[PDB]
Amino acid sequence: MEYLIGIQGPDYVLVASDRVAASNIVQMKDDHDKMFKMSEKILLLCVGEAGDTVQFAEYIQKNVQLYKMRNGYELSPTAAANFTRRNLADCLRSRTPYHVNLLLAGYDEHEGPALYYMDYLAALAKAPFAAHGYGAFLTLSILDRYYTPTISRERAVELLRKCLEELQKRFILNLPTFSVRIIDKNGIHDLDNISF
Amino acid sequence: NQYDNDVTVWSPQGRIHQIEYAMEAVKQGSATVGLKSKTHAVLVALKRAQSELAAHQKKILHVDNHIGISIAGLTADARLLCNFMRQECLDSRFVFDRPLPVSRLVSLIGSKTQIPTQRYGRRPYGVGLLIAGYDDMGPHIFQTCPSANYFDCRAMSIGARSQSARTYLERHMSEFMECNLNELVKHGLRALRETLPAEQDLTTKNVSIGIVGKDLEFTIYDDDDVSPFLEGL
Amino acid sequence: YRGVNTFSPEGRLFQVEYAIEAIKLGSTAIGIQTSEGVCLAVEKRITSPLMEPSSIEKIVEIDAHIGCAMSGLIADAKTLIDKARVETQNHWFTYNETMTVESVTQAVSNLALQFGEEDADPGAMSRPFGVALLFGGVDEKGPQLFHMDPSGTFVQCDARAIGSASEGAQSSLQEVYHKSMTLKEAIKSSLIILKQVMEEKLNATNIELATVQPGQNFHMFTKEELEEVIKDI
Amino acid sequence: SIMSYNGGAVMAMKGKNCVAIAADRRFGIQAQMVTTDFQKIFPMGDRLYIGLAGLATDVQTVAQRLKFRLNLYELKEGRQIKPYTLMSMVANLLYEKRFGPYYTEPVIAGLDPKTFKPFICSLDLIGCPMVTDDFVVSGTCAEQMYGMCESLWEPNMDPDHLFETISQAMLNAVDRDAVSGMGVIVHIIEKDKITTRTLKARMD
Amino acid sequence: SRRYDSRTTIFSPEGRLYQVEYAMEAIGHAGTCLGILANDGVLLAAERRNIHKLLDEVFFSEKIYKLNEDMACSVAGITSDANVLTNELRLIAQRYLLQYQEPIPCEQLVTALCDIKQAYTQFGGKRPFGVSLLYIGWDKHYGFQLYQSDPSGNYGGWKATCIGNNSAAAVSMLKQDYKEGEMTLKSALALAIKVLNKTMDVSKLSAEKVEIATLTRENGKTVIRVLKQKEVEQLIKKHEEEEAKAE
Amino acid sequence: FSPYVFNGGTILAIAGEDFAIVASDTRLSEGFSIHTRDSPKCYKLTDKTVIGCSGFHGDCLTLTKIIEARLKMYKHSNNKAMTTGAIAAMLSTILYSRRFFPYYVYNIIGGLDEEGKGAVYSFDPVGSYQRDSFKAGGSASAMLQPLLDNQVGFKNMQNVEHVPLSLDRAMRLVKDVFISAAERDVYTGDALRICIVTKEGIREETVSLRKD
Amino acid sequence: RGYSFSLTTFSPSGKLVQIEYALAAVAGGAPSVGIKAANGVVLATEKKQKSILYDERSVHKVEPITKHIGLVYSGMGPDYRVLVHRARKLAQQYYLVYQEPIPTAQLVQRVASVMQEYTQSGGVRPFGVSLLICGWNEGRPYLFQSDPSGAYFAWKATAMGKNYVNGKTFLEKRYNEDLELEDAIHTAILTLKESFEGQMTEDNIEVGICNEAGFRRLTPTEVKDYLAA
Amino acid sequence: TTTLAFKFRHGVIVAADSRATAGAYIASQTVKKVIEINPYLLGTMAGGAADCSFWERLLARQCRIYELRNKERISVAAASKLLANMVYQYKGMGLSMGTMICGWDKRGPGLYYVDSEGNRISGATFSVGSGSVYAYGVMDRGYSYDLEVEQAYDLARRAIYQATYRDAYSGGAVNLYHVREDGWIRVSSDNVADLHEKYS
Amino acid sequence: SYDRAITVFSPDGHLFQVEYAQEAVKKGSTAVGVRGRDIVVLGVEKKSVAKLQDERTVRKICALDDNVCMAFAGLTADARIVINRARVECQSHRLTVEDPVTVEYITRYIASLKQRYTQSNGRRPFGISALIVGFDFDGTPRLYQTDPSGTYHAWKANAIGRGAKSVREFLEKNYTDEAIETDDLTIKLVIKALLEVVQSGGKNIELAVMRRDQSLKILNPEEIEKYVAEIE
């Protein structure tokens, strides 16, 4: 399956995802990106059914950029998250659902970092740390065991290291290189990938 | 003044003026003719060119293997009506594996042309046709006017200056039933010549001929293919 | 008052006549048909120096083997061009063949005149297109040149002139052109007539020229290539 | 079943000039907790609230849509809704989707705006009102809550006794429900004040 | 039928929409409206025209309307078109709230309504809405705000404005006696009482031929209020006393 | 209620330097019974094209009527008769218009190209088509293809020059393969119909096959 | 198809003229009255038929909407019938959604909003009627008026129709906020009498009331009794 | 069925087999599984043959319209997004399509993979079909970006030959293509029997 | 639905609705545009501060895409409608083509929308004229002007609106390679040209400047006054 993980800090928000695009016993790509850049300060990580994910992500991204360009100011993380949730829910019971599981991140001048969890049934949640896919079963307990509300940013990278290395050890699939990214008051930065 | 602005506004004399203006549009077009014998039906037409470098406008079209028309008036309306006729004939073949009887096609044509002249804002079909066909009842010639009123003629001549043509036709109506195909075509050409304006003769560049008969699909003669028919006049 | 679809006491749709008047406001365009090819020449009519002459797209290609030259309004053509192109491509899709010239002219002609006010569409067209086009291209039948008018009336022409100076241009084209021209001679005569009409002195910057030949696809003359022809012109 | 997808429970009780309404906190997908900070009881008036157990997507959607309708109503009439009108409103909202319903079983609790006379009621997932004078339950641990309410309920209880009783029932019905729990959040509604307390609840 | 058509949506021979011009001509006779943006509030001051001894008192107001928790607007023109526009505004606010779970910013809203109005004056064949609006609100983007709209669909932010009867005179004093950025809510209310006293030349402020609104932020949340009779009359007494001392 | 029913029949076309042959049997069957005995599967489209249809008979009939109408429409509009490539492309489009309720018909076109040579096109029921030198379709496709590959194609045979396929050898091979198909296939074998497309026109020849 | 263009359009002076003409028709009808007593609300109009051949009971002008709110008009008849039907339908829709009796202010708002639509819609003309509604909602009386323009007004006491200006003068003279129901209905009966052109027989006027007990028309014997004084 | 395509220093190569099957019966050994969208775009056919051909031909018509409107050629990314948006309107409705789009854009040689389930990605090397797994090993071991033109030809031919050998549903002839700045060319069409003779 | 033909032909071939649309366009504040070596600049005229309007809610130069901007002259509501429509189409282009939009593409789109409303049923033509400026991906400077008839051209320097003939004559006499060499010389050229209609300047003008990657530049009043002075 696909994998997502997000850890939120007092100032930043750390996000990651795998770079594989397998399709029936064959890893068709090694440098794939599951991360969409909503705005200059909001991101979107998307995994789900092949084909639905990119369509839904591009729709939301287009709408948010059009908002920002129509108004002069960008949407907030929480407003964007609720907009996306509303669209997913509205499509849930129609003739064409989207099978998408999302991790949204963003920064705001006042509220601070925003990590937003959302499943494919259109349930939204705000959590200090979240995950998706099958890898969530082998990395969530670690996040519980070595996570504190004030955790420093470097400690956050180390904690994610624990998670990815456990996923190497005990999981069944192969996730040889991951994406990592951090949003803060100064925009978004792409950190170098955790690989083996 | 105010009784000739819409097609739904009866004039105090029991006349709709728009329909009459459409008739006028049909009368301003170039001349055309139709004939029927006991064996064939022949259309004879007179195309004209806007300038000396432009071609002469086509004015005979195909509908089916057993029907043909010859237009006189706004082309676009003629094209629309050709579309309608061809679709009807094809539907008859698809459903009934059989040629559409001509009379029925002319009836559908009349009914289709009737709707415009009774609704507000729509305008009459500004085109005049001369349908030639060959059904199980034999040869037929019909005429259609913008008012949805079709006529079962044995010979006619619509268009500009067409009245001298009609005079010649009514002059020799006795022979048409017994004539050969050649004599019939020569009668038609001769009348359409009566229409021409004095110092202007029939040429390969301004004539087209259509024919349908017992064992002969509808065929169009034009350009040098018409020379065999013209040579003899 | 006086609906769009109304017939004058002569038998002419008023809107059509007024649309035919708008073609005189347009610049002058020429087209000549020869065995070796067909050429289009038009006048860009640079109002003020401050505007890029290259930004007046007043000749476009419909397909690799078709060309179009227009006169009238800038804005009215755009939809007719898109229709012509999508029809050409549709034909290629279905039949894997190249859409002929008469057929694309016919489709564009039908798309004209389907205007009205009552029971058409949520946003159908209202007034007739006020533009006169020139289609020229090479088909299975050889070089072709077709002329279109707001009335949905199209005819294949040997040489035609459309636009503000269409009269006089036509007398010239008629005196010069013969049945055995050459493509280059056609470019020369066309450029000379254009020079004779334009108010401004002819230069490579304030015209466009295009030819289509059996071998080469529709070709646009380049600034240097234009200078090369104009110098001896 | 569908209701068991996300678990959850709600409760409401009555007393002498007071009403209480409680709901758990867990939010998960089948057998995995996702957060312990999920909100289910939604503010709806000065002393009127609403709880929704069932599908989380549906809880959130219904809450937002009902707030939409009530906002418009109050702004068009210039008066707060009264509990009975709210109950009928939700009944029409749920019943509009009789074929393809929302999967929630709302419970309402709030004093009247004028006489402050208690009022609780519960609704099916297709809009069946049920007004009681003692209590109403809903969620996945409904039977445990009936067992507790029947034994621990007595009439005309002051706010202290009422809060104790409702908290005890809520805690003791969760411990025997495997897919609902990890925190209980209580609202006690009186004429003047509103009290919100969180109880020490097993996190297993 | 073209005979009876009015052509309410077609250009005149100088590029001016006549139905729009007449619509704006209707407004210049309804009650006056005033805008004043303070540094700690916003305030609407329109005149109560329904001045009869046999009318009843109902609702919290008669010309001020709430649109959200954090927004209100006053109307000048036709009463019925006013009601229609108010309803659509309320719907817009709730639709934004449902999509984003955030209160609708103020220019979000004003431009949504004006877009409806403009579209209405662009195609359709109807008469345009003969209403001009004044709004007030707060949002985290620009703070206290004061907008205005017209039958055309144009709006504008105004530090102080006047739409309705005697608009020229009211805006003339408002230009003469506005301290840009140097106005408390109390001073703005006093300026309103003065300007209106001028404009409502019929008698003097009876404390009953007037409507006042205040929008403030209190305890972190917006609070909207319509001034009662006692405070209004006290303000008028203070105004007359100040003018008397001045002379 | 099943809307389809298999109706047997086989069809075969093989292209040459200056000719094309399309041939078919004339049996119609349903289940273990036999509807008729004079139902040819090969239909004439133009003076240089023929098409054979096999499969569900109602679909075959509807499709050939649709084809005739489309061909008439095109002639009226474009003022020329279609070519074999035009009909191939048009049929690929017609068939895919029912991807989600497909025609149960196996089509194989055969005629002359614009340079005067032979052309053969084969089709899947959903539309996919390709140009080929010989193809067979229907009930006896599997037992017909290998022999054509051996004889016309000269596959698997070494030290034999690749002689061009004359018209005589083509007619013989067609007849022989149809005899064998009738011998070992219940669905076909009632009477052989051979249409020969060439520059002069289309000829028809008939040969009797064994009834049972 | 139907005309898709508005027939009421602004004039150069910015006045919707057709609405003015509808108001003229209203001002040229039969008189009407309404007062808001401290403990009830009274409507009363005049129903002077044209001959002895009209059944007074055949039709009524004072009509209820629900058990607790009703209305009367002055203007044209058929328009009043249409508006009565629309009001009853809107009341029943409100009851169906909310399961509670519709408040009078809201029913007036809704009927008026229905009245605006015909000032702007396409191919239609304004209603030539003004209504008065009476209700007893929230233990409190309500009196509203609604005109062709779609505007409504809350009234303490009003009189519309022919000679309505003089009637409003009368009522301005005779309002006393501490009034009681019987006195209010008596004062109304008088106001109609201020201009009537004949003898007010029991079968030439109508009245309807509202109180806690519920809006309900007055039977003619009751009317004669009240008219006794 | 086996299709193949890889970018390298000198363009993007394309190679494919030519077998069609109907169950266990070999319907044709002369299919053209390398569709020629345009002079600058190529597209392979895997899965449903009719679907691939019809939708790729629609793409060709759309691209021609675009180049005719804007006066510039479409990119590989744009063409691929157009195909993906065209097929996503039938998710779960029974389409079978697997395609690699490849050309030479303003960003250099491009290679996008598009499926009927909606996938769309770009990559250096691809291979899709039933014999894809048998070709990926040979490609991966032999593939190199700086690989020469003759070497790239050899790698493609060997990969498709090996896929044909080990796979029951792929075979026939290996067609091979080149995509360059000027446009694509066709290199060779080598029968598998001849390749067996060469490699043994 | 209202289905009357608002715009209709007239004897001598005139679209009187179109003509009246441009007559409305002639009642709007002058907007100007020039094209230089590496900078484009848009210049408008503000009617009056009025000391009470909020100039933030009155903007007259707007951005359609990060690399494309536009200025109009005519009615305001129509301008707002066209701007929103263009914004939607730029974003749709980004989503579908995955490459930045180009100035000619969006100008073509806007002109097509104007033509559509000029030939549809029950629709009044837009009385607005636009000036689109920007840089394509190739980094080439561009300037297009769109009339209410649906016609567009490319320009080196055109002025649209009130007093357009005067400003166009000024630019036509003055536009030379010398005046585009220095970005300041171009900004000052636009300021000077505008200064042939407006009165006050500094507090009676707005300016806009855009560079290759540099985002839209709004010149503040103090800097604009300094630029005029340096011109002084």
Curated annotation (Swiss-Prot), chain A:
It is found in: Cytoplasm; Nucleus. Pfam families: Proteasome. One of its GO terms (biological process) is proteasome-mediated ubiquitin-dependent protein catabolic process. The keyword Chaperone does not apply. The modification N-acetylmethionine is found at M1. The keyword Acyltransferase does not apply. Its main location: cytoplasm. One of its GO terms (cellular component) is cytosol. Induction: Up-regulated in ovarian cancer cell lines. Keywords: Acetylation, Cytoplasm, Host-virus interaction, Nucleus, Proteasome. Non-catalytic component of the 20S core proteasome complex involved in the proteolytic degradation of most intracellular proteins. This complex plays numerous essential roles within the cell by associating with different regulatory particles. Associated with two 19S regulatory particles, forms the 26S proteasome and thus participates in the ATP-dependent degradation of ubiquitinated proteins. The 26S proteasome consists of a 20S proteasome core and two 19S regulatory subunits. The 20S proteasome core is a barrel-shaped complex made of 28 subunits that are arranged in four stacked rings. The two outer rings are each formed by seven alpha subunits, and the two inner rings are formed by seven beta subunits. The proteolytic activity is exerted by three beta-subunits PSMB5, PSMB6 and PSMB7. (Microbial infection) Interacts with HIV-1 protein Tat. Belongs to the peptidase T1B family. This is Proteasome subunit beta type-2. It comes from Homo sapiens (Human). The gene is PSMB2.
UniProtKB/Swiss-Prot annotation, chain D:
Its main location: cytoplasm. The 26S proteasome consists of a 20S proteasome core and two 19S regulatory subunits. The 20S proteasome core is a barrel-shaped complex made of 28 subunits that are arranged in four stacked rings. The two outer rings are each formed by seven alpha subunits, and the two inner rings are formed by seven beta subunits. The proteolytic activity is exerted by three beta-subunits PSMB5, PSMB6 and PSMB7. (Microbial infection) Interacts with HIV-1 TAT protein. GO terms for cellular component: cytoplasm; cytosol; extracellular exosome; nucleoplasm; nucleus; proteasome complex; proteasome core complex; proteasome core complex, beta-subunit complex. InterPro entries: Ntn_hydrolases_N (IPR029055), Proteasome_beta_3 (IPR033811), Proteasome_bsu_CS (IPR016050), Proteasome_sua/b (IPR001353), Proteasome_suB-type (IPR023333). Keywords: Acetylation, Cytoplasm, Host-virus interaction, Nucleus, Proteasome. PROSITE patterns: PROTEASOME_BETA_1, PROTEASOME_BETA_2. GO terms for biological process: proteasome-mediated ubiquitin-dependent protein catabolic process. It is found in: Cytoplasm; Nucleus. This is Proteasome subunit beta type-3. Belongs to the peptidase T1B family. It comes from Homo sapiens. The modification N-acetylserine is found at S1. It holds the Pfam family Proteasome. CDD domains: proteasome_beta_type_3. The modification N6-acetyllysine is found at K76. Induction: Up-regulated in asthenozoospermic sperm.
Swiss-Prot record, chain H:
Its EC number is 3.4.25.1. It is an enzyme of class 3 (hydrolase). This is Proteasome subunit beta type-5. GO terms for cellular component: centrosome; cytoplasm; cytosol; extracellular exosome; nucleoplasm; nucleus; proteasome complex; proteasome core complex. The lineage of its organism: Eukaryota, Metazoa, Chordata, Craniata, Vertebrata. It is found in: Cytoplasm; Nucleus. Belongs to the peptidase T1B family. GO terms for biological process: proteasome assembly; proteasome-mediated ubiquitin-dependent protein catabolic process; proteolysis; response to oxidative stress. It catalyses: Cleavage of peptide bonds with very broad specificity. Bortezomib binds at A49. The active site is at T1 (nucleophile). Disulfide bonds: none annotated. Induction: Down-regulated by IFNG/IFN-gamma (at protein level). Induced in breast cancer tissue. Up-regulated by sulforaphane in breast cancer cells. It comes from Homo sapiens (Human).
Swiss-Prot record, chain I:
One of its GO terms (biological process) is proteasome-mediated ubiquitin-dependent protein catabolic process. One of its GO terms (cellular component) is extracellular exosome. Phosphorylation by ABL1 or ABL2 leads to an inhibition of proteasomal activity and cell cycle transition blocks. SUPFAM superfamilies: N-terminal nucleophile aminohydrolases (Ntn hydrolases) (SSF56235). InterPro entries: Ntn_hydrolases_N, Proteasome_alpha, Proteasome_alpha-type, Proteasome_asu_N, Proteasome_sua/b. The keyword Glycoprotein applies. Pfam families: Proteasome, Proteasome_A_N. The modification N6-acetyllysine is found at K226. Glycans are attached at S129. Keywords: Acetylation, Cytoplasm, Glycoprotein, Host-virus interaction, Nucleus, Phosphoprotein, Proteasome. Coiled coil: none annotated. Induction: Down-regulated by the ribozyme Rz3'X. Up-regulated in colorectal cancer tissues. One of its GO terms (molecular function) is identical protein binding. It is found in: Cytoplasm; Nucleus. The modification Phosphotyrosine is found at Y152. Belongs to the peptidase T1A family. Component of the 20S core proteasome complex involved in the proteolytic degradation of most intracellular proteins. This complex plays numerous essential roles within the cell by associating with different regulatory particles. Associated with two 19S regulatory particles, forms the 26S proteasome and thus participates in the ATP-dependent degradation of ubiquitinated proteins. This is Proteasome subunit alpha type-7. The gene is PSMA7.
